[PDB]
Design a protein around this nucleic acid. Structure first.
Lengths: 63, 72
DNA sequence: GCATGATAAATGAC
DNA sequence: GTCATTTATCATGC
């Protein structure tokens, strides 16, 4: 065994992704308020919405 | 998007060679990923994906024939 | 029916 | 904030 060898993701629904993508088109960066609004509306945490937009921007750069 | 095509058999041997030879620290630098990308004919992003997939699947396969493959 | 490459959540370093 | 990762899902090769 090696030292480097030494939870839990769940794919979002179609509704969540579409709304998150729709908002991303308006603005790639989202304030604390809108983030709380999306979290409440899309059944997510504020951190999850935060992380999603961070990953989305990276995906947007790679393309 | 995701038009998956298996890499060259020789390219896989090159990636596997570096992986099992550096099994103590299977994290190639930026310059190391570039050298591997040129030998395999793939991009550096595909190199990072391969190592990302290999590390979790190696740890998953722990431990059957991975010990044998540590002779690269 | 799995192997394998790529993408989608989630974490951590900086 | 970016960004290289970890991990599970997905899609395709065969």
């Amino acid at each position: 065994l090696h030292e480097w060898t030494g939870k839990k993701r769940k794919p979002y629904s179609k509704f969540q992704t579409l709304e998150l993508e729709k908002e991303f088109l308006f603005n790639a960066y989202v304030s604390k308020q809108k983030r709380w609004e999306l979290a409440r509306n899309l059944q997510l945490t504020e951190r999850q919405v935060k992380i999603w937009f961070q990953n989305r921007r990276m995906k947007n750069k790679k393309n | 998007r995701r038009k998956r095509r298996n890499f060259s058999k020789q390219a896989s041997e090159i990636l596997n060679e570096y992986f099992y030879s550096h099994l103590s620290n299977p994290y190639p630098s930026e310059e190391a990923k570039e050298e591997l990308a040129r030998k395999c004919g793939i991009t550096v992003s595909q190199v990072s994906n391969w190592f990302g997939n290999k590390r979790i699947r190696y740890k998953k396969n722990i431990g059957k024939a991975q010990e044998e493959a540590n002779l690269y």
